[PDB]
Design a binder for these strands. Structure first.
Ligand SMILES: [Mg+2]
Ligand SMILES: [Mg+2]
Ligand SMILES: [Mg+2]
Ligand SMILES: [Mg+2]
Ligand SMILES: [Mg+2]
Ligand SMILES: [Mg+2]
Ligand SMILES: [Mg+2]
Ligand SMILES: [Mg+2]
Ligand SMILES: [Mg+2]
Ligand SMILES: [Mg+2]
Ligand SMILES: [Mg+2]
Ligand SMILES: [Mg+2]
Ligand SMILES: [Mg+2]
Ligand SMILES: [Mg+2]
Ligand SMILES: [Mg+2]
Ligand SMILES: [Mg+2]
Ligand SMILES: [Mg+2]
Ligand SMILES: [Mg+2]
Ligand SMILES: [Mg+2]
Ligand SMILES: [Mg+2]
Ligand SMILES: [Mg+2]
Ligand SMILES: [Mg+2]
Ligand SMILES: [Mg+2]
Ligand SMILES: [Mg+2]
Ligand SMILES: [Mg+2]
Ligand SMILES: [Mg+2]
Ligand SMILES: [Mg+2]
Ligand SMILES: [Mg+2]
Ligand SMILES: [Mg+2]
Ligand SMILES: [Mg+2]
Ligand SMILES: [Mg+2]
Ligand SMILES: [Mg+2]
Ligand SMILES: [Mg+2]
Ligand SMILES: [Mg+2]
Ligand SMILES: [Mg+2]
Ligand SMILES: [Mg+2]
Ligand SMILES: [Mg+2]
Ligand SMILES: [Mg+2]
Lengths: 188, 58, 126, 142
RNA sequence: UCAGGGUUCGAUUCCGGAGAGGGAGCCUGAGAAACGGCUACCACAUCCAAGGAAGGCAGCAGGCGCGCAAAUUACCCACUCCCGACCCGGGGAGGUAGUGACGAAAAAUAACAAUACAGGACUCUUUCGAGGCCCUGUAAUUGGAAUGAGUCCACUUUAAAUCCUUUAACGAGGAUCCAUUGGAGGGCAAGUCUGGUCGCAGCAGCCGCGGUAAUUCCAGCUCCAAUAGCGUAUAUUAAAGUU
């Protein structure tokens, strides 16, 4: 039957062709340790979103200059990159995009900024806090560790206004034990 | 040699049984990867040029 | 109190004798606000009555805090009784619902389609 | 040493390639159809059958054993095929005259390994797996 | 799927065509060679007082059969639209919920201190040795803190409900609120451990293992790869400059 639905969906990664290759396994394991991710797939996502930028960059760079299409779409792609802190406005041209490394998309993750902006003790502690709804972007709780922080959103990350760590009722542990002083240590 | 030489399931039957000894729940998920990074990259106490494998016995 | 109403994209519709708008409810710490408790504050906002006011939608964001819904405020009561969908007049009783399934209606019609002149007992004796 | 290169030779090139494809074995059996007509399955991945009896086939030298096979007759075709049983002591789960679901071996038409002329293997005996009948996760329904 | 060229697929929600068991003939109408219309032959099948009558799920559910192979005889016109003499009636079209590891997106199963051992830059001592800051495990406890999976009042949702989101009350010490699937000679990441079997039982996609001292079989231990998923059979594409 005809039906009122979107079937449109897509994949966001690609497995590697050589399944057991040491130069690969040791590099990806390094990248998992240094940013505290969960699978290899959390790396293959970033590899995909970079290798797809590097196809648009190349196909533009193989157009001739002064083109309408190349001008418009290049000025649009550099803007989109600069706006997330992967590129420097002092570069602002296509032949620099080909010089970006995977460890710049990983660096802009919310998990990374929550550690590097000081709110957590380690890159692993940060992933726990985000997932426990302790942090807020701009008047908005967030719960996704992989959220990518836009350039001017940077200085808004702070602890949630309904949370123990800063203006909030103590959690269900600090309250069960303070009650052990009046229900387990006073008459119990 | 005794019985039918073709006796099916010979070795799986006459093998003596041993239980799983363990108790310890292993780690899972991100916390497991956190383990493997530390053991393979953080502290690697130095050794002679004849390098060794992570399950070596001999 | 924490609760607060703020309207948005207001429009005075004369072609249907109502004014319609969008409603923002800044209610941190608490559960969602009951619809009754909203419509009386809209009254105090527009100075009419908690009887020509209808509100619906009201989805709450992630994280708590805000919710946004749609609201309409009629001129008379009877214009609301004409221009509203029936189930929205049922919510706060101003209408009632009848025959107890789609199957019974369907199968009565199919038994009645086999007699002529007076369908009689198929309704009058069930 | 000569292949027409000219600007209007497309008919020759196409009609010649269309011919030479028929010497490529792997293409030929996809399109003559005599393979699919002769296949003891239906051109499917799996087929049900009834176990006629149990045999052992001596493996091809140098290595030596007796390989513990069923001989099955398939439901849909009715044609007879021999199948391997895939683990230590499984041949005791297979009673006689029950059903089975045979599958392929792994090289798409050809006898695998040391066994002479056996091209299929069992997965289910009576709606229960062999891997579960053998690991203990389930027992025979009787 | 794909450097560039190509190869293979398209019953399947949009558009066009064709058909209501098979063939044939026609009524009515602006429009039909119409089957939720009629007439006759062919094949099936139902009721009978044996005179007669009645039928077409390749609509929605449901059942038999077939097979390697596919969900409930639920709810409702509130949404999108259509039909009618019509602002009002009707709609298995269509919407809603149920079953659903076809498949796609996000993402939990532990965080942090103390203490003890372990290891390095640094300080001091001719060294030894000591002080030590930065990390890792690893132990015993602990140490307290954090939070959902759940149980569950209300609001919200909607045609009426469910779900998600919003919220009170309970809910974590690790012996559970327990991660699996396949491997460990080579290709190909990981043991020249221990016990058993003796060219047997078996493994093995390929080369090859087993004949009393098995890195390959059966199992314990340890280790490897992906991980809420992994293995197998099959069709097909790249590898194939082997069309
Ligand atoms: Mg259908
Ligand atoms: Mg020839
Ligand atoms: Mg041949
Ligand atoms: Mg050989
Ligand atoms: Mg292409
Ligand atoms: Mg088509
Ligand atoms: Mg067909
Ligand atoms: Mg279909
Ligand atoms: Mg069509
Ligand atoms: Mg046309
Ligand atoms: Mg039919
Ligand atoms: Mg007419
Ligand atoms: Mg007709
Ligand atoms: Mg029709
Ligand atoms: Mg009729
Ligand atoms: Mg008839
Ligand atoms: Mg019909
Ligand atoms: Mg049907
Ligand atoms: Mg069946
Ligand atoms: Mg299926
Ligand atoms: Mg079936
Ligand atoms: Mg309608
Ligand atoms: Mg109506
Ligand atoms: Mg439907
Ligand atoms: Mg899936
Ligand atoms: Mg669990
Ligand atoms: Mg929940
Ligand atoms: Mg209700
Ligand atoms: Mg295992
Ligand atoms: Mg094995
Ligand atoms: Mg072993
Ligand atoms: Mg190997
Ligand atoms: Mg190796
Ligand atoms: Mg011995
Ligand atoms: Mg031995
Ligand atoms: Mg041994
Ligand atoms: Mg090919
Ligand atoms: Mg070939």
């Amino acid at each position: 039957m005809p039906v009122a639905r979107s079937w449109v969906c897509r994949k966001t990664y690609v497995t590697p062709r050589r399944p057991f290759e040491k130069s690969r396994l040791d590099q990806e394991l390094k990248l998992i340790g240094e940013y505290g991710l969960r699978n290899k797939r959390e790396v293959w996502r970033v590899k995909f979103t970079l290798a797809k930028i590097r196809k648009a960059a190349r196909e533009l760079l193989t157009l001739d200059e002064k083109d309408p299409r190349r001008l418009f779409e290049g000025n649009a792609l550099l803007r989109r990159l600069v706006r997330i802190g992967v590129l420097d406005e002092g570069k602002m041209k296509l032949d620099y995009i080909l010089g970006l490394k995977i460890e710049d998309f990983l660096e802009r993750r919310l998990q990374t900024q929550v550690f590097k902006l000081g709110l957590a003790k380690s890159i692993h502690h940060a992933r726990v806090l985000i997932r426990q709804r302790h942090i807020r972007v701009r008047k908005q709780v967030v719960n996704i560790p992989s959220f990518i922080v836009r350039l001017d959103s940077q200085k808004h990350i702070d602890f949630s206004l309904r949370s123990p760590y800063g203006g909030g009722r103590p959690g269900r542990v600090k309250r069960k034990n303070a009650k052990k002083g009046q229900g387990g240590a006073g008459a119990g | 040699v005794h019985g039918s030489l073709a006796r099916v399931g010979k070795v799986r039957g006459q093998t003596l049984k041993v239980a799983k000894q363990e108790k310890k729940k292993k780690r899972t998920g991100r916390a497991k990867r956190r383990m493997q990074y530390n053991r393979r990259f953080v502290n690697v106490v130095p050794t002679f040029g004849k390098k060794k494998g992570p399950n070596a016995n001999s | 109190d924490t609760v607060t109403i703020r309207t948005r994209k207001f429009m005075t519709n004369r072609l249907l004798q109502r004014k319609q708008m969008v409603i923002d409810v800044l209610h941190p710490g608490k559960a969602t606000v009951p619809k009754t408790e909203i419509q009386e504050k809209l009254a105090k906002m527009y100075k009419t009555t908690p009887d020509v006011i209808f509100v619906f939608g009201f989805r709450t964001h992630f994280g708590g805090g805000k919710t946004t819904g749609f609201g309409m405020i009629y001129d008379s009561l009877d214009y609301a009784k004409k221009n509203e969908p029936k189930h929205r007049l049922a919510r706060h009783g101003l209408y009632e619902k009848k025959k107890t399934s789609r199957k019974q209606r369907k199968e009565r019609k199919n038994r009645m389609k086999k007699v002529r002149g007076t369908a009689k007992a198929n309704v009058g004796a069930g | 040493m000569g292949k027409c290169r000219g600007l209007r030779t497309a008919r020759k090139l196409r009609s010649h390639r269309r011919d030479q494809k028929w010497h490529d074995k792997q293409y030929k059996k996809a399109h003559l159809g005599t393979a699919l007509k002769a296949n003891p399955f239906g051109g499917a991945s799996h087929a049900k059958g009834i176990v006629l009896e149990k045999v052992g086939v001596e493996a091809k030298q140098p290595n030596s054993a007796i390989r513990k096979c069923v001989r099955v007759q398939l439901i849909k075709n009715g044609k007879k095929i021999t199948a391997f049983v895939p683990n230590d002591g499984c041949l005791n789960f297979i009673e006689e005259n029950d059903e089975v679901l045979v599958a392929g071996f792994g090289r798409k038409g050809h006898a695998v390994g040391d066994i002479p002329g056996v091209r299929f293997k069992v997965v289910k005996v009576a709606n229960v797996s062999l891997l579960a009948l053998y690991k203990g996760k389930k027992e025979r329904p009787r």
